[PDB]
């Protein structure tokens, strides 16, 4: 337990996520107190929602912590798919919070501004700190998307609060809600697509275009007859696993062919390669 | 579309499963409209429960029809991971609904809505009847959804005999806890498959396979053994063998393939490296 925290502070993304966790629960206590201070009209709901947000941040932090673990017999590849799974569940949570924004808009449908300013300062701190989001490339992408969704949703609710006061429109809140949900869903689509591609054992998109030339280079090797059962997939970000079977001549140089195939697929970016070499009868 | 309708009305097992769906979605609509009508949060939570159970079934059919597709260059293994992903996604969605209705239940327990509209206040024993007949007549989730309807059973009795407003939130949190408990095992299996974990049905026989491969003549060591689950009962295994400078690579390859095929591995890649000395 004591050494768990030192591993957390050693890792940059983990320490930033713990910064966010501590800040989120501190402001949660503050706003819960302000909530039970005789103002529980809609803020109790807001309190519970940013508890959900803190849960998502905790999911990202836990994903990083498990990702830096050591492999064993049960988890021979490690726990490096935890970042991909976190990105996936964070994208799905963003879809669900888009649905919740839609429900909030439908709460009005056809028929004081102080928790939101601290939410705004929290979320601009998030934009500043997590600018490099764009195990970092998968966890920080989902965390950046979640923080952006909360950021721009709070922006939308403040836009509603400022339109009903300055010019007195009663329709802008549902329309800003549908704009809000549509924009965050459109933003979260690419991360879900990449996560689904990784978890479906799809060929890595960066590796996909360079693979036919790699197969041509392997087929050009002296004494190789055919390539079979070539499978490439993404383990984690920028780690590709590849397998293929080679039918070679009955007297082919298996050492040289193995070394050349490994070289060819190493220049392409395949970290883990398994080449089975089968000697032909004829 | 004409051929589809006649076929599904003549078979038997498909007829029972489509009865399962159509009745379940129908009463999901009815009890959702009753819940949004009055203040039955617990009832709309139960509606979300068996709504997502019906989506689990129909997403199972959709994932089956997707995994029937032929593999291409991009998807080398095919679309067989679609069933695992669909189960995982629906489990996550059930978790999310459980958490949100937990939140709304605590909010309702803070201040009770005091609506208690009756009308056909007996929608709840209709829900009990329908999920009983669904789970028995048709085909831990085999009995978890039975406990979901009993939550609104006592809420309606408490919502009539004394009108105690604390009951409906308590049923909402109880339903949420039941949902997460029911969903946990499927999520565990899906997480294990998607994390490239060694298949549990293969883990106990793997040390014996390693000892058998090591006993092969000319084999020096086993390195970088990786086994994972592609889909149900389809295991992919990779390993690298360091062998003698003059070992029988053909025989060693055949014996390693036999050893791991007897253990249940369907896709095996054995890389053989000849030692310098």
């Amino acid at each position: 337990i004591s050494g768990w925290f030192r591993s957390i502070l050693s890792d940059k993304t983990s320490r930033n996520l713990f910064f966010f966790l501590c800040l989120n629960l501190s402001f949660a206590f503050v706003e819960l107190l302000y909530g039970i201070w005789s103002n529980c009209l809609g803020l109790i709901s807001d309190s519970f929602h940013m508890f959900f947000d803190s849960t998502a941040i905790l999911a990202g932090l836990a994903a990083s912590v498990i990702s830096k673990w050591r492999d064993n017999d049960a988890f021979s590849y490690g726990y490096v798919r935890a970042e991909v799974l976190a990105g996936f569940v964070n994208g799905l949570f963003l879809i669900f919070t888009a649905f919740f924004i839609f429900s909030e808009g439908v709460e009005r449908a056809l028929a004081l501004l102080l928790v939101s300013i601290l939410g705004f300062v929290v979320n601009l701190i998030g934009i500043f700190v997590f600018k490099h989001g764009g195990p970092s490339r998968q966890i920080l992408q989902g965390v950046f998307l979640h923080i952006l969704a909360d950021t721009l949703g709070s922006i939308g609710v403040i836009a509603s609060a400022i339109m009903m006061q300055n010019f007195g429109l009663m329709i802008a809140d549902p329309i800003c809600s549908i704009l809000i949900a549509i924009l965050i869903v459109v933003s979260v689509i690419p991360l879900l697509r990449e996560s689904v591609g990784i978890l479906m054992q799809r060929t890595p998109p960066l590796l996909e275009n360079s693979l036919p030339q790699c197969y041509q280079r392997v087929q050009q090797l002296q004494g190789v007859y055919s390539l079979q059962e070539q499978h490439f997939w993404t383990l984690c970000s920028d780690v590709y696993v590849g397998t293929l079977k080679l039918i070679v001549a009955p007297d082919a140089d298996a050492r040289w062919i193995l070394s050349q195939t490994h070289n060819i697929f190493t220049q392409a970016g395949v970290r883990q390669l398994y080449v089975q070499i089968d000697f032909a009868a004829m | 579309i004409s051929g589809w309708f006649r076929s599904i009305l003549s078979d038997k097992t498909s007829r029972n499963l489509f009865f399962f769906l159509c009745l379940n979605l129908s009463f999901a609509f009815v009890e959702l409209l009753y819940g949004i009508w009055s203040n039955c949060l617990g009832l709309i939570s139960d509606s979300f429960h068996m709504f997502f159970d019906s989506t689990a079934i129909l997403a199972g059919l959709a994932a089956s029809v997707i995994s029937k597709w032929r593999d291409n260059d991009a998807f080398s293994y095919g679309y067989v991971r679609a069933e695992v992903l669909a189960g995982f996604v629906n489990g996550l969605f059930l978790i999310f609904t459980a958490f949100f209705i937990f939140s709304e239940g605590v909010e309702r327990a803070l201040a009770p809505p005091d609506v208690h509209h009756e009308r056909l206040l007996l929608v709840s024993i209709l829900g009990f009847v329908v999920n009983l007949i669904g789970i028995f007549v048709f085909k831990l989730h085999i009995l978890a959804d039975t406990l979901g309807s009993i939550g609104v059973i006592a809420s309606a009795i408490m919502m009539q005999n004394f009108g105690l407003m604390i009951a409906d939130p308590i049923c909402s949190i109880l339903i949420a806890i039941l949902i997460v408990v029911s969903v946990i095992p499927l999520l565990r299996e899906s997480v294990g498959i998607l994390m490239q974990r060694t298949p549990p049905l293969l883990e106990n026989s793997l040390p014996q396979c390693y000892q058998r491969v090591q006993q092969l003549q000319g084999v020096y060591s086993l390195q970088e053994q990786h086994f994972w689950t592609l889909c149900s009962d389809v295991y992919v295994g990779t390993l690298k063998l360091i062998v003698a400078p003059d070992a029988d690579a053909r025989w060693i390859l055949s014996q390693t393939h036999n050893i791991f095929t007897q253990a249940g591995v369907r896709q095996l890649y054995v890389q053989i490296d000849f030692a310098a000395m």
Partner: antibody
Amino acid sequence: EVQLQESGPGLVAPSQSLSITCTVSGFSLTNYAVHWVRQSPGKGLEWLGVIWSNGRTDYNAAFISRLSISKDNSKSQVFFKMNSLQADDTAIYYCARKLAYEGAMDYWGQGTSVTVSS
Amino acid sequence: DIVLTQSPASLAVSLRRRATISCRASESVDGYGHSFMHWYQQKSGQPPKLLIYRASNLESGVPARFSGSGSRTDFTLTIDPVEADDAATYYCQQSNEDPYTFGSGTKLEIKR
């Protein structure tokens, strides 16, 4: 008993074709690759090509447009056809059995001297 | 391609002594622990005879006085002791890269 015999024309007119037959004994062409190497006083030992057990041919990129190697497993013969013979092609042409599972060549024929002149 | 440079072009060594022939490769002929370099011996009016394959493995039936060593780009053929029948030309051949290329050749001259 592993023995390779090359039989070809000693004299070849310039810009004509050179055809050498390598007859093997003591091993089968069904599981052995045969290389072709020429040795000249100027350019030394030059590797030309190899025919594999299934008929796959790999050639030197300098001769790819004018070289062709074929074989027939029934009579255990390998056929070496070269076109556009020029004055720099005077060399002793060997057919060599590839050392099994290695990139070397363990058995060589005696070699046929080929003189390209008018 | 890979250019193999043999030094010296000619070597004079007396009886019962050690002779050293070096082959230098333009690019590395190593792959995953194996050095795809082969040594041949060609006597007068004879086809080349393989001595060492993969830079340290004696061909079956060659005398134990022939030795090979080296890796990456630098390789050494060592004859110890040097006999009278070792009067021949020694070639290094690489097989790491297509096309196969041979060394320039080193003539071992027997001093008497």
